[PDB]
Amino acid sequence: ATIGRISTGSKSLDKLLGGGIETQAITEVFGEFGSGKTQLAHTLAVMVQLPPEEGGLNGSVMWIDTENTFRPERIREIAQNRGLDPDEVLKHIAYARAFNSNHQMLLVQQAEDMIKELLNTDRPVKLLIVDSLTSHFRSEYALAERQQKLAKHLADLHRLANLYDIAVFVTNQVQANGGHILAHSATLRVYLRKGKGGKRIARLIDGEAVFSITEKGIED
């Protein structure tokens, strides 16, 4: 399949990303608590449902939450302000909460079943969000076992991205008092941070985009 792109909702961030986040790729966004990673996730879950002319892929969404931070009311607001029917947008986001890291792994296997079911339809899965990817692994394991467990989990996610032409979008909290970037395992690493005046700044790791969090999700 060709490489699809999902607009982030910000023209600035889209330019930095070459058009948006890619299918057949894992995009890892990392940064401090409060930097806007989950807002980017919420916005992408709407944007992917737009037609390609507006930067979407007419796609369905699967969301794996580890911290109870998915907000249907926020999806509704973004959808309404992006010109979509919010009820339809929410109907096309399959939501699951991971109880622990082992359940998180099983949820990725279950995601494959729904990806297969929708593969030949007009609303195939095009976006799999894992927010937060690392939190359970950090709480449950010391570093050595944590690295081995993370490696298999990321291998599973890569495989889904390539085999089924999906964008995998993962968030990762890293700040002075804890957290660690997923090393070299993502396809693409994006560093997000707060700037003056409520702005958010993104940079590719291994120019900078600037955007705001608004009723449209994020935008320039």
Would you kindly provide a written description of the structure presented here, covering whatever features stand out?
The chain has one domain. With 220 residues, it is α/β, with parallel strands linked by helices. A hairpin with a 2-residue loop joins strand 10 and strand 11. Helix 5 (101-118) packs parallel to helix 7. The chain has helices at 11-16, 37-47, 72-81, 86-91, 101-118, 135-140, 143-164, and strands at 5-6, 21-22, 25-31, 60-65, 93-97, 125-131, 167-173, 188-194, 200-205, 209-214, 217-219. The strands form two sheets. It has a nine-stranded mixed sheet, sandwiched between helices. A two-stranded antiparallel sheet has the order 1-2. It is classed as dna binding protein. Keywords: RAD51, RadA, inhibition, fbdd, DNA binding protein. It forms a monomeric assembly.
Secondary structure category: alpha/beta
Number of DSSP-assigned strands: 11
Strand order of the largest sheet: 5-4-6-7-3-8-9-10-11
User: How does the major sheet shape up?
Assistant: 9 strands, mixed
Percentage beta strand: 25-35%
Helical coverage, percent range:
25-40%
Number of helices: 7
Domains (count): 1
Radius of gyration: 16 Å
- Taken from the alpha-carbon principal axes, the silhouette is globular
PDB class: dna binding protein
Keywords: RAD51, RadA, inhibition, fbdd, PPI, DNA binding protein
Assembly: monomeric
Entry title: Structure of unliganded HumRadA1.3
